[PDB]
Design a protein around this nucleic acid. Sequence first.
DNA 1: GGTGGCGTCTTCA
DNA 2: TGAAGACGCCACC
Length: 89
Amino acid sequence: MPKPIYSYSILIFMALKNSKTGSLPVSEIYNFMTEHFPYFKTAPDGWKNSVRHNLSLNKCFEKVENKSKGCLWALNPAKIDKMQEELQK
DNA sequence: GGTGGCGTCTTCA
DNA sequence: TGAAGACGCCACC
């Protein structure tokens, strides 16, 4: 169908804020996106790469220390207001 | 061949 | 300057 109106940053923010602990491995970010935005179930390859590009670059998201193979990703708490504002559009 | 972290390159404002 | 994202690389298993 159409792409979501949301940037990848906001899509990731939705996935993480919706989670039980507030952090997810990227495989579960993908599952959130395909479950909530069925566009991604059939989207051309590459979108996963873009999600991970955003996670690494954006200081909005922080890589969490593995507790006891993918890392967990979490929100930068100082950037939640900004992400919340952008979501309200 | 898939996965995940991060990089390159272009477009645009 | 830099947001934004399409697309690439490569260590690792």
